[PDB]
Design a binder for this molecule. Structure first.
Ligand SMILES: O=C(NCc1ccncc1)c1ccc(Oc2ccc(C#C[C@]3(O)CN4CCC3CC4)cc2)cc1
Ligand SMILES: O=C(NCc1ccncc1)c1ccc(Oc2ccc(C#C[C@]3(O)CN4CCC3CC4)cc2)cc1
Ligand SMILES: [Ca+2]
Ligand SMILES: [Ca+2]
Ligand SMILES: [Ca+2]
Ligand SMILES: [Ca+2]
Ligand code: NA
Ligand code: NA
Ligand code: NA
Ligand SMILES: [Zn+2]
Ligand SMILES: [Zn+2]
Ligand SMILES: [Zn+2]
Ligand SMILES: [Zn+2]
Lengths: 166, 167
């Protein structure tokens, strides 16, 4: 017999990403900084390293789209679903899509891209939703307004259960 | 926290299904009986339970269609691909599609819906094709009209969901 094998975790520590396209709502620089800081969330507590590619295939392909955008998990216009990401593996595995019918921001007027991205990359790296209301992996958006981010312990313990500390 | 499981499987044992539309070839009652029996192939050897929903959103949406029918697995007319079903997951995951350019039957003629649906629902539950020519998950159609799930499929499905009541 055969089952559909999943990859619990990436079998390599060095991962690439590519920003395929960009939201209208933020400058290229603000989007780049939001994603780089979202990766640093997980690279700071694990041996994972993340490198940006500008062209060609990367492990984590990042894009903005609306409605039906090429994977038959369509977005739903403003609100509701904000973004989704696929667990580790080849092709669509690791990839992260953000609903460009939301308003993305570097601050608070809209959904903070960094926070949402750091959440989605937890999925890309093999975390499902937490039931802990204080977790980054909790499936509800909250914005504290604090200038500094600290990864909650629940997410630290979940990511390290896969990859260990750095 | 929660990690994703090692195999694509359902994280709940109570699943729902919806017959979204029906083939011209058979009565609604014949179709319902075929799918109900096809689900019993798998519930009989696991702790899984299946409940029919008449509308709205079920875990396993079942539909009949031809050619391009809204995914990356378009059908291809008579024979060839007979049906397909997505592995467990949200949205289209679990769903089962049957090519209505085939002739579906409740007998030995054309393709027996019960048999093909029992195969497809293996996929809906997380089994891929088997290499064993004796298996239900073998990707070549064979009619039988006696039903015992072959051992390869039993071991496959129980590796994911356990045996349920060993009865
Ligand atoms: O799409 C989403 N939800 C709706 C949905 C509807 C249907 N299916 C799936 C999801 C969704 C929601 C939220 C998403 O990302 C996020 C999830 C959690 C947070 C958070 C948080 C904090 O509480 C705020 N501080 C203190 C502790 C943590 C971290 C910093 C931020 C974004 C990402 C996606
Ligand atoms: O579409 C199909 N194959 C062609 C194809 C597949 C994938 N990509 C392209 C084409 C296809 C073929 C068969 C399908 O369902 C079936 C697969 C196997 C069987 C069987 C069988 C038996 O030997 C007969 N008895 C005794 C032992 C077992 C179980 C009961 C029945 C239906 C379902 C789909
Ligand atoms: Ca990928
Ligand atoms: Ca949305
Ligand atoms: Ca066909
Ligand atoms: Ca489904
Ligand atoms: Na937008
Ligand atoms: Na399949
Ligand atoms: Na038909
Ligand atoms: Zn998508
Ligand atoms: Zn999420
Ligand atoms: Zn289909
Ligand atoms: Zn098959």
């Amino acid at each position: 017999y055969n089952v559909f094998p999943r990859t619990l975790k990436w079998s390599k520590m060095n991962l690439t990403y590519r920003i395929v396209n960009y939201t209208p709502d933020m400058t290229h620089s603000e989007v780049e900084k939001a994603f780089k800081k979202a990766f640093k969330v997980w690279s700071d507590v694990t041996p994972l390293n993340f490198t940006r590619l500008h062209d060609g295939i990367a492990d984590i392909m990042i894009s903005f789209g609306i409605k039906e955008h090429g994977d038959f998990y369509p977005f739903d216009g403003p609100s509701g679903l904000l973004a989704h990401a696929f667990p580790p593996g080849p092709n669509y595995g690791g990839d992260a899509h953000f609903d460009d019918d939301e308003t993305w921001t570097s601050s608070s007027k809209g959904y903070n891209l960094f926070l949402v991205a750091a959440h989605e990359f937890g999925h890309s790296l093999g975390l499902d939703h937490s039931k802990d209301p204080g977790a980054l992996m909790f499936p509800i958006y909250t914005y504290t307004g604090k200038s500094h981010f600290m990864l909650p312990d629940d997410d630290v313990q979940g990511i390290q259960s896969l990859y260990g500390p750095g």
